[model samples]
Target: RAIDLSRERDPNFFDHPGIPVPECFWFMFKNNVRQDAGTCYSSWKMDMKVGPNWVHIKSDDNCNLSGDFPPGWIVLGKKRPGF
Candidate 1:
């Protein structure tokens, strides 16, 4: 549970220099996700590449390590860090 939160909060872990989300927007790593939290869905119109074949992932979490999801699933999220 805890690990999920860590990645969620800092899903990019070290974060990225590209997205650069502001604090007023939302947390890079919100709690509960890695702490026995429920599943939440969020979609974005990002400038990133999206397709059935995903090459990279922002959060390196899984159903066990991060949280449960559809089998053979790939995560899609923005890259933000704490200012």
Candidate 2:
């Protein structure tokens, strides 16, 4: 579901504090101007969707995407069943 950025909220959809163990979540970023999307693994690794392939976001050893969502960037996350 889309995260309401206007308010203070947790990004994780589940009751747990973090993404579910071994789950892969698909995240999309949207706004009135542009849109981007990605997939985040349970390991906290993120891959940005580019053209037809997914590119790994390598800035951080593991994607440390904790805390409030950035303003103006509407984010949507859905959990994928774990293996």
Candidate 3:
């Protein structure tokens, strides 16, 4: 299942060059089962390649950590109905 970002109303720090503002969030999954964002952050130590740079997956912030889909994980950018 994909994570929902429709209710995420917090600001983030993703003002770096070439990195656009994120529309959603994502988390890593193992054994073909999806886990919570907290679990993915703590368990997985990886980085996401954005454009020509590599962004570190640190927190659950959509801007800095999510937006594009990374390998081995699920993304959360599906817009809700009547949005």
Candidate 4:
């Protein structure tokens, strides 16, 4: 199934209140946009594809909640190569 996890109208995607966000990812970091498209894409060895909002979790300890999925968990994003 295809899914679209884009920003929505209203308050704002990054300005959402409550947990899973304003609490979990309270701290921001220097994002790296240094991945070579060809190398990164061609070398991407996986059953599924990594979308635009596909982010990695970095923390000192296990702060993510168990069982339920993490917040801001996006599926396929815009301009997916595979159809």
Best by TM-score: 2
| Tens digit per residue, CA lDDT, model 3, 1-83 | 44445554333334355654333334334333544432123223356553344555543432334444445554333222322
Sort the candidates on TM-score, descending order: 2, 3, 1, 4
What is candidate 2's lDDT per residue for 5-82, written digit by digit as tens? 334332444435564443434444545332543345544544554334455543222333432344544334444443
Q: Each model's C-alpha lDDT?
A: 0.29, 0.42, 0.39, 0.24
Residue pairs clashing in model 3 are: none
Q: By lDDT, who's the top model here?
A: 2
Q: lDDT tens digits, residues 1-83, model 4? A: 22212332112235334533222211111232212121111112223223333344322222222121134332221222231
> Which pairs in model 2 have colliding backbones?
none
Question: What ranges in model 2 sit over 4 Å off?
Answer: 1-22, 32-34, 43-65, 81-83
Model 1 residue 7 CA deviation in Å: 4.2
lDDT of 1: 0.29
Write one digit per residue (lDDT tens) for candidate 1, span 1-83. 32333444332233245765332212222232221222211232222122233233223222222233333433333323332
* Consecutive 10-residue window with the lowest summed lDDT within model 2: 58-67
TM-scores, each model vs. reference: 0.21, 0.32, 0.24, 0.16
Worst 10 residues of 3 by lDDT: 36-45
| For every candidate, C-alpha RMSD to the true structure in Å | 10.9, 9.5, 10.8, 16.6
